[PDB]
Design a protein around this nucleic acid. Sequence first.
DNA 1: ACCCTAATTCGATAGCATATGCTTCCCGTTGGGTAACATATGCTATTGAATTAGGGT
DNA 2: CCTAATTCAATAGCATATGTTACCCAACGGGAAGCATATGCTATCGAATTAGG
Lengths: 147, 147, 147, 147
Amino acid sequence: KGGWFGKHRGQGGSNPKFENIAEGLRALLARSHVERTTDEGTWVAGVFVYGGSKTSLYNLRRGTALAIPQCRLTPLSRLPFGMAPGPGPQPGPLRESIVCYFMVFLQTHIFAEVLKDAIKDLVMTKPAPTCNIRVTVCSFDDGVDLP
Amino acid sequence: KGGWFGKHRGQGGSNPKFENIAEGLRALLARSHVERTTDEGTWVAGVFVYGGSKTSLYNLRRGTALAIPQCRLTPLSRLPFGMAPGPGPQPGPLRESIVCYFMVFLQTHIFAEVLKDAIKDLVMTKPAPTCNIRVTVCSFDDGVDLP
Amino acid sequence: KGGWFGKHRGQGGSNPKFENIAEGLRALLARSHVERTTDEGTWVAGVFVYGGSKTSLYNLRRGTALAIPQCRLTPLSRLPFGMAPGPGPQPGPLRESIVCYFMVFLQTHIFAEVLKDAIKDLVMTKPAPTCNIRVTVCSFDDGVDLP
Amino acid sequence: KGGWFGKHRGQGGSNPKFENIAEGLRALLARSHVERTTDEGTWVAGVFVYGGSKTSLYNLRRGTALAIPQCRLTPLSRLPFGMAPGPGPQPGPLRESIVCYFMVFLQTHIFAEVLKDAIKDLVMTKPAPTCNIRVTVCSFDDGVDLP
DNA sequence: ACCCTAATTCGATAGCATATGCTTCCCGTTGGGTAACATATGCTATTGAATTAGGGT
DNA sequence: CCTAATTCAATAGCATATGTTACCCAACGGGAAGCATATGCTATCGAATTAGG
């Protein structure tokens, strides 16, 4: 099983698994009734989603793609190693670890938080590896010019 | 031309090209007597570097890695589309553009502003398409826990 | 497949279904680091749980049974009818509907709202009837003297 | 003596016995003209009545029901045990007792505190074991949507 | 000032190794609905033992 | 230092409620196979600025 299915990349569809991960989201983000698009449309906020595993982090993005068509989604990449313990030479800035990450772009400082707090709670119940997905809020000082 | 040169993802060495990029950044940053590492070792601020062209981004990433042994770098990744002008359907959240980005994790917020400038400045000196690269500072409200 | 199992009322045990439903409660509960018992041991608080279905309420009482040993739990009963629509005589104050409900007794008003918000979040991500379960906070003005 | 009498749960009717209780209430609260209803028909407050004995609680539920067609009454059901005196092993949460309780749902927060005092004095005048019934006022921060 | 002709710069490129996106089968987990035995309550009318009223002294 | 009347709780008993388990099985959601295609990496090549008797 598996192979090519005629829809390339950045062009993912809708599957019963995701739309439940999405519905589970677009119920937790309900609790707060905040704005999602600004009159200006500039991307000044964002949510940074990482950890767990690549399968978990993917399905979560795939659901978030459905729960929030008012946002824009990077594909999953990887993270640089941290700061190594002990006082030796540190790992080389460019170095790659196996943990993935993706980014959620948004137009709103406020509803960034609403998503960060919903993802933290959607994840928190599930059994591993979903429990290990982590979320922080990032806000871009100068806005980001998505094409 | 081309082939396997034994160096895997994130283990790129330095060659007179990339340390030449990195020596430009170091002269902009040897004016700046700021501290680059905290003791809690937490990664709170980011420089989001994007646009330009895959390769000059790739080169700039590669110089930044030699100038700044205190940063951490993602790999290159793609941006998704912004809003669409005029009318019609909007882009899908997931839909991805030809435009690239990487990120530069850092331990202090004072050094992100500094490094956003050096990069904005250093790239304005180099010929096109390099100089169309854009830089915006992140702040992670909770911090990024790099592995 | 049915029958007697030597477990009277208010004397139920533990099995891997309730233990994971209580796992997912603890998680939503850890978010606030608030105290759960005082030195008077007065029962001054409460969480009134109801709706959804009898089975789904039971699995949630059974779960909160494990997740919170500092509380005490009533068995399930049924709710009386509300206000009939229109201006005819209302339903008899004694006549009961099929909704069930249970209660949780607690020693601090603060931890009561942590469990209100913990149950409300736990459930809304789940598919029916678990998400029709509803939660309000109680506070007994003179305390309740459990035997 | 005994047996089936056609009447299912919550469908219990008037007889000269209970209307002697209901008219004791209707004389303690008669010359307190406060308003028992609202137009929103929201069930914000309760009066928790418990202790006493299984049957003399049963009569008072049945009295309270004729006196007040503005209230709603649960059926009877049991209380869990309280704190055992001394750091000996504690009763389980689900632990249940020989003591019973019912609740009185109400639409106003004033009439709640009226009906607590009417009951607390309607019980003052009847012989033991009745006089040991404990009445406490209850409030629902989010209210109870009765079916 | 002019200007055609050297070095000089980086970006663009080829090409191996290996990423992710996309989906379809897989399958352990999560979690509600049910059967079936001991035992709760709701319901009535009848029965029992206190507290209460009566009227002799 | 008083025996008839009174007041309610306690009762028997049918029909039915949940407490409890173990069994069933629909779904929720992570992991892997497998094609197109993206990057990391290097050294080499090419097309733009910058330069001198």
